[PDB]
Amino acid sequence: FVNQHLCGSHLVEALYLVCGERGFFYTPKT
Amino acid sequence: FVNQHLCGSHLVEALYLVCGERGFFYTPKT
Amino acid sequence: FVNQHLCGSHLVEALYLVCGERGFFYTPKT
Amino acid sequence: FVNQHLCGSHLVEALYLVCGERGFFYTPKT
Amino acid sequence: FVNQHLCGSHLVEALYLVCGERGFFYTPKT
Amino acid sequence: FVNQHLCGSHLVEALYLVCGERGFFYTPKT
Amino acid sequence: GIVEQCCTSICSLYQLENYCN
Amino acid sequence: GIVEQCCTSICSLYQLENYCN
Amino acid sequence: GIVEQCCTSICSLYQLENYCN
Amino acid sequence: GIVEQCCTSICSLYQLENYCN
Amino acid sequence: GIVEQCCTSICSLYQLENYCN
Amino acid sequence: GIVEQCCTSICSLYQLENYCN
């Protein structure tokens, strides 16, 4: 259960990296 | 100019930490 | 066993974030 | 001024890495 | 001077993310 | 399977920290 | 949705774009 | 907006909530 | 103590304060 | 070389590939 | 090789040197 | 103290030990 709140921290690093300047909506509350 | 794309990576860590389960929209393209 | 030495790296990010300027003692040797 | 609250996040990564299992007191309020 | 040893930590995150499974040689000693 | 692509991000932090200025080759494709 | 999908087997670059803004 | 505001002097917990979803 | 407690189900903000200095 | 090049204005995805293995 | 070895029980400082450049 | 000292020119491994517990 902690993996989500922890790995999600790295998912965003790749998200705004792929998006570059574009933004992204991150919603972990699946 | 790199500080934004780098520090922004830590801003999200606090964002989804404060939001807990809630999500958040991160848009660095100010 | 690696999760501790790895997730603990993110626990501190929230710790000094919640503490703001205050400090905090982190002891993983439980 | 943001560098402290941001780079300090990586200082702890090396601290508990060098300490291994030992703990460490992190006080950014210099 | 600290920015290099600190931002370089995020450069690798994108490197092995773009490489996916491929590896990469990181040499900060420019 | 995600642990590798995620924990590997912290392994590099310690690698270039121990190496200091020296570089290091990181190949997750074992 | 996005976490359970990328925190299970890593999403691909083209998959992450769907969440881009 | 949010980056230039928090990457300059660190935003406060109550300030980060405004961006929460 | 603090790791096994927060690295199992995530500690709450009020729980992290107990470890603050 | 790679740090001074990407830690100054962020390298592009195609630029990071040159360092891939 | 290096990931499966350090992401299983944490490698020691002397073990990480073998991968240094 | 420790931040201004290591966030200015990076502290050495032996310097970080002084802060170890």
Nearest-neighbour CA in chain J from B3: distance (Å)? 9
CA-to-CA dists, residue G4 to A30, B5, F21, angstroms: 8, 25, 37
The closest CB to that of C26, out of D5, D8, D26, belongs to D26
Q: Quote the CA–CA distance of B3 and B5 in Å, as a whole number.
A: 6
Nearest-neighbour CA in chain G from F2: distance (Å)? 6
Quote the strand ranges of C1-30, DSSP E: 24-26
Number of neighbouring beta carbons within 10 Å of residue I14: 8
Handedness of CA L3, L5, L6, L12 (dihedral sign): negative
All residues at 6 or more sequence positions from B5 whose CB lies less than 8 Å from its CB, including other chains = A16, A17, B28, J10
Q: Quote the CA–CA distance of C7 and I7 in Å, as a whole number.
A: 6
- Single out the residue of A15, H9, J8, D3 nearest to residue B28, CA to CA: A15
All residues at 6 or more sequence positions from G12 whose CB lies less than 8 Å from its CB, including other chains = none
Residue contact A4–G3, C-beta within 8 A:
yes
L13 interfacial to chain E (CB closer than 8 Å): no
Neighbours of chain D (3+ CB pairs under 8 A): B, C, E, F, H, I, L
Nearest-neighbour CA in chain D from B4: distance (Å)? 11
User: Could you give phi then psi for residue C26, rounded to 5 degrees?
Assistant: -110, 115
Residue contact I3–C25, C-beta within 8 A:
no
Q: Do strands B24-26 and C24-26 pair parallel, antiparallel, or not at all (unpaired)?
A: unpaired
K20 interfacial to chain F (CB closer than 8 Å): yes
Interface of C with A in 1-30 (CB under 8 A): 3, 6-7, 10
Residue contact B18–H4, C-beta within 8 A:
no
Contact residues on chain C for F3, CB-CB shorter than 8 A: 2
The closest CB to that of L16, out of D3, D4, D15, belongs to D15
What are the sequence ranges of the domains in chain C? Answer: 1-30
Handedness of CA C9, C10, C15, C16 (dihedral sign): positive
Method for structure elucidation: NMR
Number of neighbouring beta carbons within 10 Å of residue B26: 22
- Tokens 């100054």 identify what position? J8
The answer to whether the CB of A8 falls within 8 A of the CB of G11 is: no
Q: Quote the CA–CA distance of A3 and F3 in Å, as a whole number.
A: 9
Residue contact I13–C18, C-beta within 8 A:
yes
All residues at 6 or more sequence positions from G14 whose CB lies less than 8 Å from its CB, including other chains = none
